[PDB]
Design a protein around this nucleic acid. Structure first.
Length: 183
DNA sequence: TAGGGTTAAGG
C-alpha cells in the first residue's frame, strides 16, 4: 500500500466536456482507479480543465505514463506525477523540465556516482558537475538532464536521494531568469 | 493544465 500521493496523476489539458466518468473510462485501462475526478469551478460548476486519477499501485501509475500520449474525449491531455499541495507552493514546481539541480554532493563526487543513482529513473542525456570559474574548485552541485520530463518528476516527488554515499537535495532546474524572479 | 468545505490548539 503505497502513499496516495505517489499513486496519483495530475491530468492537464482536459477537454471542456470530460467528466469523472469519461476520464475514468479512459485511465481505467491501465489499472484499478481508487479515485478519479475532474476539477471544476464551485459556482459555475464549469470544468477547470484538469483532474486527477489515482491507481491502486504505483506500478499501474507507471504503466499509465508509459502509454503516453493519451487522448481523452478526442483531446490530447498531459498526464503528470501529482505534486503535493505543499510542494506546489514552490516556484516552478509544476514546470515541465528535463533537467534537475542536484545540491549538496561531496567534492570528490564523480559522474559514475550520479549515474549509479539516477539512471534508474530514466535515460540520461547530460551530466555536469559544477566548478568555479578560474578557480577550478568543485562547487558542491550538479545538473543532470534526462530525455523524458517524467524522469524528473518521478525524482522530485521523492524525499531522499543518495549519491556518492550521502543524501543530496534534488529540485527541478530553474533558468537564470526563473531563479532571479523567484528570489 | 495544480486539488475536492484538505494545514497552528489550548494548554
Amino acid at each position: 500500500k503505497e502513499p496516495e500521493q505517489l499513486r496519483k496523476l495530475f491530468i492537464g489539458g482536459l477537454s471542456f466536456e470530460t467528466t469523472d466518468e469519461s476520464l475514468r473510462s479512459h485511465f481505467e485501462q491501465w489499472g484499478t482507479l481508487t479515485d478519479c475526478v475532474v476539477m471544476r469551478d464551485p459556482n459555475t460548476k464549469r470544468s477547470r480543465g484538469f483532474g486527477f486519477v489515482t491507481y491502486a499501485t504505483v506500478e499501474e501509475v507507471d504503466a499509465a505514463m508509459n502509454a503516453r500520449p493519451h487522448k481523452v474525449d478526442g483531446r490530447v491531455v498531459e498526464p503528470k506525477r501529482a505534486v503535493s499541495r505543499e510542494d506546489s507552493q514552490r516556484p516552478g514546481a509544476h514546470l515541465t523540465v528535463k533537467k534537475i539541480f542536484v545540491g549538496g554532493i561531496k567534492e570528490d563526487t564523480e559522474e559514475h556516482h550520479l549515474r549509479d543513482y539516477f539512471e534508474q529513473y530514466g535515460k540520461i542525456e547530460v551530466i555536469e558537475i559544477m566548478t568555479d570559474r578560474g578557480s577550478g574548485k568543485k562547487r558542491g552541485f550538479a545538473f543532470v538532464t534526462f530525455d523524458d520530463h517524467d524522469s524528473v518528476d518521478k525524482i522530485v516527488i521523492q524525499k531522499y536521494h543518495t549519491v556518492n554515499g550521502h543524501n543530496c537535495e534534488v529540485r527541478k532546474a530553474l533558468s537564470k531568469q526563473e531563479m532571479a524572479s523567484a528570489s
